[PDB]
Design a protein around this ligand. Structure first.
Ligand SMILES: O=S(=O)(O)CCN1CCN(CCO[C@@H]2O[C@H](CO)[C@@H](O)[C@H](O)[C@H]2O)CC1
Ligand SMILES: [Cl-]
Ligand code: NA
Length: 472
């Protein structure tokens, strides 16, 4: 039983637009902040890589569907490129080529018995909107609503699973470093919080838009995908436990408390720690933006499910470190990793499968067991088809998730492996491989070929259980 997937549970794989599509300026697509970063600042990216071509999925989408069908995916999670649809960011011009492209992908998926799951925003803001300040500028919440309306109107007759945003915990950090994630602006502890605030507002507008203009006719579900690491207390002390709760609230709670609790608003510890730190540093005003009571009420409850992106764990102990001002310093935890944990090809990613179960239980208890769709989970290596580490990563994480479901009563409803194929891995270029299909980035045809992990995942998807040889 503990090794069998529930009958209605949805299994598949996931990608993101800038990571796979290429065709960065083809057929009317406007520039986004990743075009800007990779073109203007190749020194920020391993190998000076760009997403100009990537997997060429703009041209090769039928090949993506072919491999999804081979895999036996029930669902394919992909993102839509805002600037491919609205090249100017604003909704004055709709690019028919972009409409046609996503319709073509959606229709191909459905013709092959694969359900589309669409992420509206996976990090590729139109440059025209960044030029207004980007996410720190609250005007982007209305612009996001208008973008979502175009998506619902054009695609919502066939798409019934939506994520507004992918991992704003990460993309807000594009406003906390001069050399990091696009748009690579150095306003730590100030601009990243403003970005978060706008994203939460935007999410809520999009959810209400769906309720008002589309839900009755379309009958789908709207969620948001949040990344969170498990944070294990470095010792069993109450103080170290406090630090790990701080971590959860400052990473997951920042977004999930406003949306997924009955109370709404930011977590108290977030408001209080930032208030105190801001006062101590001499600011008249807290660095953390505020919601009015009316906004709190508007934002809370804007969900049909919670998307979770889970990769790894950290150790947390009592204390404060990091630069003043910064979210990490404000969070009041000292973070490390255990040298004993298995490694990957990514410095930040260690293999800690039991952390997945712990995180799922933390979510269950904090948010009253919302339906949870695992929108990303995966592992990096530097190459190779005999990807034993990736196979082990998947089988262990899936076993831990199944324990969360069956033993712990967590309402997990689906899982999409990150990623369908090797792709442009942001600042790491093509140097880190997350795919279950390999892609030859030196071959203009970009062939996709299955790794051992794709074969094992196909076996899991076909049999709907963890094969005996991977059981404890
Ligand atoms: O610049 S660093 O400070 O050294 C490391 C930045 N973190 C940001 C959070 N990522 C995990 C969640 O982010 C996921 O990660 C996947 C693998 O990286 C990506 O392919 C997905 O697009 C993304 O959603 C991990 C890397
Ligand atoms: Cl066997
Ligand atoms: Na339209």
């Amino acid at each position: 039983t503990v090794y069998t997937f529930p009958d209605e549970f949805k299994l598949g794989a996931a990608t993101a637009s800038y990571q796979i599509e290429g065709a960065w300026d083809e057929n009317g697509k406007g520039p986004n902040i990743w075009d800007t970063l990779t073109h203007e600042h190749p020194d920020y990216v391993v190998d000076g890589a760009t997403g100009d071509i990537a997997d060429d999925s703009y041209h090769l989408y039928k090949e993506d569907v072919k491999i999804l069908k081979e895999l036996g995916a029930q669902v394919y999670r992909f993102s839509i490129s805002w600037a491919r649809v609205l090249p100017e960011g604003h909704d004055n011009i709709v690019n028919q080529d972009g409409i046609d492209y996503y319709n073509n992908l959606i229709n191909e998926l459905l013709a092959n018995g694969i359900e589309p799951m669409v992420t509206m925003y996976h990090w590729d803001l139109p440059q025209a909107l960044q030029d207004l300040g980007g996410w720190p500028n609250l005007v982007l919440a209305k612009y996001s609503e208008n973008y979502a309306r175009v998506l619902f109107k054009n695609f919502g007759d066939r798409v019934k699973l939506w994520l507004t945003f992918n991992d704003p915990l990460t993309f807000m950090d594009g406003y906390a470093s001069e050399i990091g994630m696009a748009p690579s602006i150095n306003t730590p502890g100030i601009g990243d919080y403003l970005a978060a605030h706008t994203v939460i507002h935007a999410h809520a507008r999009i959810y209400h838009l769906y309720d008002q203009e589309f839900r009755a006719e379309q009958g789908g579900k709207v969620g948001i995908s949040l990344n969170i690491n498990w944070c294990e207390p470095a010792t069993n002390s109450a103080e170290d436990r406090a630090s790990c709760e701080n971590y959860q609230q400052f990473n997951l709670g920042l977004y999930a408390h406003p949306i997924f609790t009955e109370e709404g608003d930011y977590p108290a510890v977030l408001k209080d720690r930032v208030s105190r730190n801001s006062a101590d540093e001499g600011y008249t005003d807290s660095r953390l933006p505020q919601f009015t009571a009316e906004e709190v009420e508007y934002i809370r409850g804007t969900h049909d499910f919670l998307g979770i992106n889970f990769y790894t764990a950290l150790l947390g102990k009592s204390g404060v470190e990091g630069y003043e001002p910064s979210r990490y310093r404000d969070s009041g935890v000292i973070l490390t990793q255990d040298a004993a944990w298995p490694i990957s090809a990514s410095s930040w990613l260690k293999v800690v499968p039991w952390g997945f179960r712990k995180e799922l239980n933390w979510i269950k208890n904090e948010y009253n067991n919302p339906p949870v769709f695992i929108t990303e989970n995966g592992f990096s290596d530097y190459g190779g088809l005999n990807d034993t580490g990736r196979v082990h990563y998947y089988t262990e994480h899936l076993k831990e998730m199944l324990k969360a479901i069956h033993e712990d009563g967590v309402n997990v409803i689906g899982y999409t492996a990150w990623s369908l194929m090797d792709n442009f891995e942001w600042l790491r270029g093509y140097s880190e491989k997350f795919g279950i299909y390999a892609v030859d980035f030196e071959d203009p045809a970009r062939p996709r070929i299955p790794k051992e992990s794709a074969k094992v995942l196909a076996e899991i998807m076909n049999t709907r259980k963890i094969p005996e040889r991977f059981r404890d």
